[PDB]
A paper describes a structure:
pmcIn the process of photosynthesis, light energy is absorbed by light-harvesting (LH) complexes and transferred to the reaction center (RC), where charge separation initiates electron transport and subsequent formation of a proton motive force. The Rfl. castenholzii RC complex consists of three large subunits (RC-L, RC-M, and RC-Cyt) and locates to the center of the LH ring, and the relatively low r.m.s.d. value observed between the earlier structure and our higher resolution structure was 2.449 Å. The Rfl. castenholzii LH complex consists of 15 pairs of αβ heterodimers forming an open elliptical ring with a gap at the 16th position, which is occupied by the insertion of the N-terminal TM helix of the Cyt-subunit (Cyt-TM) and flanked by the TMx protein on the outside.
The 15 αβ polypeptides bind a total of 45 BChls (30 on the periplasmic side and 15 on the cytoplasmic side) and 30 Crt molecules (16 γ-carotenes and 14 OH-γ-carotene glucoside esters). Of the latter, 15 γ-carotenes are embedded in the TM region between each αβ polypeptide, whereas one locates between the Cyt-TM and the neighboring α polypeptide, and 14 OH-γ-carotene glucoside esters are positioned between two adjacent αβ polypeptides with one OH-γ-carotene glucoside ester missing in the 15th αβ polypeptide; the 16th chimeric pair does not contain BChls or Crts. The Rfl. castenholzii Crts could be divided into two groups, A and B, based on their biochemistry, orientation, and position in the LH complex. In contrast to group A Crts, group B Crts are positioned between two adjacent αβ heterodimers (instead of inside the αβ heterodimer as in group A Crts), which is similar to that of group B Crts from Rba. sphaeroides and Rba. capsulatus. The Rfl. castenholzii group B Crts were identified as OH-γ-carotene glucoside ester esterified with C14 saturated fatty acids, with the β-ring facing the cytoplasmic side and the glucopyranosyl group facing the periplasmic side of the membrane. Collectively, the group B OH-γ-carotene glucoside esters combined with the group A γ-carotenes fill the space between the adjacent αβ heterodimers resulting in a blockage of the pores observed in the LH1 complexes of phototrophs containing only group A Crts. The tightly sealed LH “fence” of Rfl. castenholzii is thus likely unpenetrable, and as a result, alternative strategies are needed to facilitate quinone transport.
Residue numbers in the entry:
A (entry chain Y): 1 to 32
B (entry chain C): 161 to 267
C (entry chain Z): 3 to 12
D (entry chain H), E (entry chain J), F (entry chain N), G (entry chain P), H (entry chain R), K (entry chain D), ...: 3 to 41
I (entry chain T), J (entry chain V), L (entry chain A): 4 to 41
N (entry chain L): 30 to 315
O (entry chain h): 12 to 58
P (entry chain K), Q (entry chain O), R (entry chain Q), S (entry chain S): 6 to 55
Write the structure that this text describes.
Amino acid sequence: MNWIVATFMLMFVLVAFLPLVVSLAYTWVTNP
Amino acid sequence: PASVGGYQITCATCHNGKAAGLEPYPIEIMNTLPNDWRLPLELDYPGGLVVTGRKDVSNHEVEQNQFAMYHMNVSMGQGCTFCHNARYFPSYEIAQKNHSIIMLQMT
Amino acid sequence: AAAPAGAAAA
Amino acid sequence: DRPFEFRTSVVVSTLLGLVMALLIHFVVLSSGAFNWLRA
Amino acid sequence: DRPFEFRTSVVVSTLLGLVMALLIHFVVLSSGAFNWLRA
Amino acid sequence: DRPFEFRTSVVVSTLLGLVMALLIHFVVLSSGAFNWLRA
Amino acid sequence: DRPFEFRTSVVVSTLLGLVMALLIHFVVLSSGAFNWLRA
Amino acid sequence: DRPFEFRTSVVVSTLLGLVMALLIHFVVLSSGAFNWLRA
Amino acid sequence: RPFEFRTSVVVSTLLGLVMALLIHFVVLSSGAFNWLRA
Amino acid sequence: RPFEFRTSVVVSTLLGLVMALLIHFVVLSSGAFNWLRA
Amino acid sequence: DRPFEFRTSVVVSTLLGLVMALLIHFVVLSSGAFNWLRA
Amino acid sequence: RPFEFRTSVVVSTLLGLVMALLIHFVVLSSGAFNWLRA
Amino acid sequence: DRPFEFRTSVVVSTLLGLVMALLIHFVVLSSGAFNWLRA
Amino acid sequence: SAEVIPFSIIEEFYKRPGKTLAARFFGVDPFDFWIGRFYVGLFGAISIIGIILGVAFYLYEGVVNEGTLNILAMRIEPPPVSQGLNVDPAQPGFFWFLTMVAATIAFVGWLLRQIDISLKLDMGMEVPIAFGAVVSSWITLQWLRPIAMGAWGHGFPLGITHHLDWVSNIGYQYYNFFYNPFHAIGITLLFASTLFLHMHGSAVLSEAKRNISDQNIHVFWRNILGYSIGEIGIHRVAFWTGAASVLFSNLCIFLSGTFVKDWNAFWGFWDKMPIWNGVGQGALVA
Amino acid sequence: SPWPVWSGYALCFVPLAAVILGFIIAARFTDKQATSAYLRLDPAKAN
Amino acid sequence: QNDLVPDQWKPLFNNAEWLVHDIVVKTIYGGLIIAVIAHVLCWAWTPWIR
Amino acid sequence: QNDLVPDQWKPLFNNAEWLVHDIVVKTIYGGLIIAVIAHVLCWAWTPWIR
Amino acid sequence: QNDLVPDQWKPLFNNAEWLVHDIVVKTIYGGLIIAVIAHVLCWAWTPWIR
Amino acid sequence: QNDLVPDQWKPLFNNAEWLVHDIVVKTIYGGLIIAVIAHVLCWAWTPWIR
Amino acid sequence: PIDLHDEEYRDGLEGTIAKPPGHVGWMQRLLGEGQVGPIYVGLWGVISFITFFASAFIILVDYGRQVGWNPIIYLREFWNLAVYPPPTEYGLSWNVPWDKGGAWLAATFFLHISVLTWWARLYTRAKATGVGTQLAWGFASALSLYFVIYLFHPLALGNWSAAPGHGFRAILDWTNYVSIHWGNFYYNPFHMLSIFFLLGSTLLLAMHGATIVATSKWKSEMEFTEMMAEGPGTQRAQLFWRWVMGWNANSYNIHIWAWWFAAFTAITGAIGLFLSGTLVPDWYAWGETAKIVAPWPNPDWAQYVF
Ligand code: BCL
Ligand code: BCL
Ligand code: BCL
Ligand code: BCL
Ligand code: BCL
Ligand SMILES: CC[C@H]1c2cc3[nH]c4c(c3C)C(=O)[C@H](C(=O)OC)c4c3nc(cc4[nH]c(cc(n2)[C@@H]1C)c(C(C)=O)c4C)[C@@H](C)[C@@H]3CCC(=O)OC/C=C(\C)CCC[C@H](C)CCC[C@H](C)CCCC(C)C
Ligand SMILES: CCCCCC/C=C/CCCCCCCCCC(=O)O[C@H](COC(=O)CCCCCCCCCCCCCCC)COP(=O)(O)OC[C@@H](O)CO
Ligand SMILES: CCCCCC/C=C\CCCCCCCCCC(=O)O[C@H](COC(=O)CCCCCCCCCCCCCCC)COP(=O)(O)OC[C@@H](O)CO
Ligand code: HEC
Ligand SMILES: CCCCCCCCO[C@@H]1[C@@H](O)[C@H](O)[C@@H](CO)O[C@H]1O
Ligand SMILES: CCCCCCCCO[C@@H]1[C@@H](O)[C@H](O)[C@@H](CO)O[C@H]1O
Ligand SMILES: [Ca+2]
Ligand SMILES: [Mn+2]
């Protein structure tokens, strides 16, 4: 295992979580 | 068969540098099993741990099968697929299953 | 008369 | 009014009859008690 | 007013007949009782 | 007022005929009874 | 008016013809009966 | 009024031609029948 | 009237670029040329 | 005015940047230059 | 108004009796103490 | 009205039934009495 | 005004103290350094 | 207030030209029009090209190169793991690679076309987010994990009943897959999604054609559970749960072959923590 | 023989055909109901 | 409507439904005759009850 | 509306569907003739009932 | 509009649809000729019925 | 608009679509000639029907 | 004639508790509603509570007995403790020792009673207000699979050990063992139908939620008033899905799709599980006879070995 490519791909898998987090944050901010 | 290497059994096997105090079944290998389980060596092989399609058998026997099968795959450093095609467990299409039958008879 | 739900209420 | 409608009776009876017929055919023909459609 | 439409009767009967015909032809074909479509 | 339209009849009959033709060709080919497309 | 438009007929006929042509070419090439594309 | 527009016809024909050219080039390359682009 | 010069420029440029990339990748993968070879 | 100079500048700049990154990645990860490991 | 309803008590008692009958039959007939329906 | 008769009746009846069923289950599983023994 | 309430700080402090006391008691009991509750 | 509108006016009112992504990048959308009921734009052509080529490549690899007309007995399989990350036109697994790339192009084009159609109607971007979750699931199954592991032969085969053999063998290689924490979270979210869908469908159907007010369903859902969520809250919960179910299960399958080899040996730390190790007796030790 | 057993048609193929045909027909009828003329708010005044 | 139908079946049939019904019953009669003939021929070939 | 349709079938057709109906029935007749010829030839080749 | 169409087919065709129809039918006839020739050549090469 | 389109194709074409159509048909003829030449060269190299 | 205030603020057995409602702020900000309570506590609701807590008490006390009445071992081992049905040597008998199957029998009987009484609660509280009874029949469809798993499949097989144990890990073990015992469950056609409907339910839930939130600027989530006249939000949702797929739905029949897709899952699963042991004892062999298994003559097994 290269451990450098694997961590880049893990970073991509984690970045895939971002739009849902942004949706929750937008809902929270826009409803005071 | 000769494809496995032709290795022999000597004193360093079963001992690994110790005269007495040998410990089969140490606490390290009992991670997910009850700490009193032992290999069922009073049965007959092949046929002692077969469960597929049997209507005189239920989940108790399947659990007793699974304990032994996890022991076998922990003592090899491998997964369930060293010896099976996981789409049909009765299948004998891997040679390690025959080797395992011979090694169950030996033990 | 004709309603989104398939009803025809006066 | 009447307790039940004619249409409901027809639907229930027809479906029950069809399902019972198929079930009885499956149970009887798959028992091996009768020599039917055999090579 | 009549309990059932003509259109419903036609649809139900035609669908049931087609399904049953296909099922019976395929059940008889694979039994081996008749010398039909045999190599 | 007619029960069925002409368009629905045409669509249903045409689709049924095409599907049956394809199915029967597939079955007769895979049976192995006729020479046909043998190597 | 009329049952079907002209453009729907054209679309259906052209799509069906193209699909059938591709299917028949694939089946005949896979059958192995002809010396068509061989190394 | 005409059934089809000229723009739609151009687009559809161009798409079909490109797809067929790519498909045939990829099939012929890997068929192994021709001594083309061989290592 | 349904044909504008800018849209055709966009379409042709995209098609040419994609075709060039595809042909480069396929020729590199074939292994018929001693190009970028270990 | 059909073509805006700003749009062409932006499009060409982005295309050049993307092509530079792609060619770097393709050349570096090959039998030759072997990620500069040598 | 009414502290107790006849209908509710009827429903509850009937259901309790049926459940008890089923349970007692199961427990008694699955124990093997009585010679009932022996092959 | 603080205490209602209907609630007391329902709760007491249900508690008694549950207790009777539980005691029968435990005594049957104990094996001390002959009862439904083979 | 105030950043924190008295109620919140009291709740948090009491919970933290109880959890830490239990954790330390468990660790010291399982460590085996002291005799304490021996058989 | 309200009157009968035949739906031709509602469709013709909302059709506008040029508010898409390509219209903002190039200044114009080359294919900005409608074919039948569908909106064709850019990314509506790329997607259709990918769809046609993927179907053609799949059927050629199945019918030919395997010689079977049975659709449920094909094995459209990748190259072996001994080939590494190399592609060769003269070796098995080439039509699997072509089909995989075409399918990727089709799925990404579908996502971008959804973004375009959202932009035309002045909506939010919830549908592209929800679809991009499962698109990323496909990407991690077929691109990221094979690249990290080191071969294209680590992807699953595209056969109808045979991709279930890959699932079975991969799940029993890293036994026990049930003991994967992210697997459990994903299963929990799938079951919760089905429960919530049934609850919402029942709730809306139960009040449809009745001379009642819009506050009856709140009283119904407060008499039974003590709490009623609301009208936008239930649809938000639906969206969030649906997306998260697959977002969490990406991690389990990625970490199965790269950082972990055994999901039974993962839980070996639990009994060794100082809070409760060394407190039991025989067969209750550890 | 190249043919499946009768259980193959009973449990596998008839349910698949039923599912596909039911999906097609349900889609046809739901789209027929959705795109008809009923009470709507006028798009001109509402927006 | 309700013109060509007989007096007995007026509350159940239309003018067009009556004609379609006649077509359907003729189809069923013909199919029944053919089915009887086919069953007799196949029994002569190979009896399936033994 | 329906001038070419015979009086019997007026409640079911208008003259823009009578023509399409005639086309369809002619197609079906031609197909049936070809099908009979094909079946006779195939039986003469190899009988499928033995 | 509906003036180049023959009187029989007026309720079904326009002028533009009539022209496109003529083009389509001529295409079909040419394709059928080519298909017949291709089939004769392929049979002469290797018959597919034995 | 359509003042140089032939009278026969007036209902179908426009003034600019006529010129674009001419360009497209010339493209297709040139492509067909090139394709015929390429096929003849490839057959002379290695026949694919044996 | 239904008085909602009386339905929510009545006293007695046929009435509510937690009468002064609470309020949670983060639920108000995220979900849009934050009031908690009051909750109805009438008959059919006390019976469920009492029987559920009887079964739970039995299970937890047996956990404690197994551990040895040691709280620390209890906390350590809580997620792999279970009570199992009587083993295969017993059949469907009830004369089983308490630490070998009697506890499971008692707890399961009480659980059955509680779920039935909860169904009755849903039904009667739906009728008491002005709404129809659609949740009760969905729960009935869900309970069909529950009673197949716990009562009818063991009854047809002939032993109690065909049923799951009561534990966090025991359900996973039951799933694994039941798949292993009867061939391979991937080749069960009704398991394929169940998975079809489950994944369709998740897809449809995500689609409906996303498209209602995306059009919520024009109050499209007020689906009660949108079934009398549809405004800009519903029109935009219809146009979106028509321009994407070529067909769309209403603000009425989409929830019909939801109900039936969620309902079919449990019914198909119940049929498949019941057939699993009693008619087809091996699903891979059956699939081989039914022509749905691929040959696979030369596997590349270097993928499946470390
Ligand atoms: C890919 C399709 C292209 C297109 C490519 C061509 C080509 C190429 C030609 C035309 C031609 C025409 N096209 Mg154009 N055309 C397109 C779209 C359109 C549209 C539209 C609104 O979409 C319209 C109204 C037209 C209109 C027209 C007419 C103006 C013109 C006359 C047809 C004709 O000759 O009749 C007769 C119609 C026939 C179909 C006869 C053809 C016979 C068939 C095709 C036989 C197959 C050929 C085979 C090899 C020959 C041997 C077979 C047998 C042995 C005989 N085209 C699209 C964009 N078009 C023709 C032209 O301009 O003439 C100078 C012409 O050559
Ligand atoms: C299903 C495919 C086609 C279609 C295929 C045909 C074909 C082919 C024919 C017709 C014919 C007719 N069709 Mg049509 N027809 C269709 C749709 C329609 C629709 C509609 C609005 O959908 C209507 C109202 C009709 C109605 C009609 C009549 C105008 C016409 C004469 C009725 C008839 O045959 O009497 C008598 C009714 C019968 C059912 C005859 C009985 C024969 C049946 C088939 C039994 C078969 C067994 C054996 C062969 C014969 C045994 C005889 C029996 C003991 C009586 N069709 C669809 C689109 N239709 C016929 C026609 O035009 O000829 C004058 C004709 O040949
Ligand atoms: C003989 C061998 C088997 C046996 C095998 C079967 C089979 C197989 C069947 C029965 C059915 C019956 N058997 Mg038995 N049965 C046996 C022993 C018994 C014993 C006993 C104590 O031993 C009893 C009480 C019964 C009792 C029964 C009844 C429940 C039922 C007949 C009455 C009825 O409702 O059908 C009368 C039927 C009707 C009233 C329906 C009318 C049918 C209509 C006309 C449809 C006809 C189909 C036709 C082709 C459609 C053409 C339509 C076109 C448009 C032309 N069976 C033995 C063990 N039994 C049948 C059943 O239907 O179960 C409900 C059934 O199929
Ligand atoms: C034994 C194996 C034989 C063989 C024997 C046969 C036989 C026998 C036949 C063919 C036929 C064909 N074969 Mg061959 N064939 C062989 C090998 C090949 C190879 C190859 C590289 O090996 C290829 C490229 C082909 C190619 C062809 C095509 C030229 C032709 C099928 C046309 C078609 O699909 O119509 C289907 C397409 C349509 C129905 C639609 C397309 C037509 C219109 C004009 C499309 C343009 C319209 C445009 C899209 C706009 C539409 C308007 C609206 C907007 C929709 N053959 C070998 C050696 N082949 C057939 C033929 O002759 O056809 C003429 C035929 O009968
Ligand atoms: C090694 C594992 C095996 C496997 C072995 C099995 C076995 C065995 C079964 C399944 C079943 C299912 N499998 Mg499987 N399955 C496999 C792999 C998969 C994969 C995959 C990607 O690999 C998927 C998607 C699935 C999918 C599924 C589901 C479709 C289905 C169960 C859904 C359901 O309705 O449960 C929801 C559960 C219920 C509806 C019942 C329980 C809920 C009730 C209502 C509880 C309410 C009362 C409760 C006590 C309340 C008290 C709580 C209080 C609030 C405190 N399986 C492989 C092949 N699978 C089940 C099935 O039915 O299919 C035939 C089943 O029995
Ligand atoms: C995120 C939670 C869930 C979810 C939601 C989700 N899916 C979605 C959406 C959303 C929000 C859409 O808006 C979208 C849609 O409906 O658009 C029309 C869609 C969609 N999700 C779909 C399917 C789908 N989603 C699934 C699951 C899920 N989707 C989740 C569990 C699954 C599975 C296996 O669980 C599948 C099958 C489609 C109905 C649609 C996407 C339509 C699309 O992408 O079109 C492009 C391509 C085609 C129409 C044809 C492709 C042909 C191929 C190129 C050829 C074959 C190659 C292929 C790789 C072979 C595969 C064979 C298999 C047997 C392995
Ligand atoms: C084991 C597998 C079994 C598979 C079986 C699948 C079943 C298929 C049958 C589908 C239902 C067909 C319905 C036909 C009749 C509907 C008529 C209609 O149009 O119904 C409308 C609503 O239907 C609508 O949403 C349309 C119908 C309801 C919406 C869809 C409901 C099904 C949801 C999923 C269930 C299965 C479908 C998918 C299966 C994979 C309402 O209109 P009305 O105001 O009443 O109209 C009055 C008059 O104009 C004459 O009707
Ligand atoms: C996994 C398997 C592969 C995937 C297959 C995907 C294909 C199809 C799936 C289902 C598609 C149909 C969806 C609903 C049907 C469309 C509805 C409709 O009817 O829409 C039509 C649009 O289709 C039109 O033009 C035509 C639109 C184009 C249709 C043809 C697209 C084919 C795509 C390629 C398919 C693969 C080919 C591979 C070759 C081997 C037009 O209708 P109108 O008469 O104008 O309507 C009347 C009015 O109310 C609106 O105008
Ligand atoms: C595995 C089958 C073994 C092989 C191979 C050898 N020995 Fe062994 N031996 C084995 C066990 C399980 C034990 C008992 C362990 C214990 O704790 O008592 C032994 C014991 C011995 C002893 C006695 C040790 C003692 O009494 O302290 C001796 C002297 C001994 N074994 C010698 C020995 C030799 C020389 C071997 C090679 C020829 C050999 N053993 C192999 C298991 C196994
Ligand atoms: C967008 C990502 C495209 C695929 C990325 C992989 C680059 C291919 O590059 C590969 C290397 O990754 C590999 O180490 C050796 C042999 O395994 O052969 C090379 O061609
Ligand atoms: C309502 C539930 C149906 C009751 C079914 C009863 C099945 C009885 O079956 C029993 C077995 O369970 C028992 O083990 C042996 C003991 O010899 O005898 C049988 O009769
Ligand atoms: Ca242990
Ligand atoms: Mn909703």
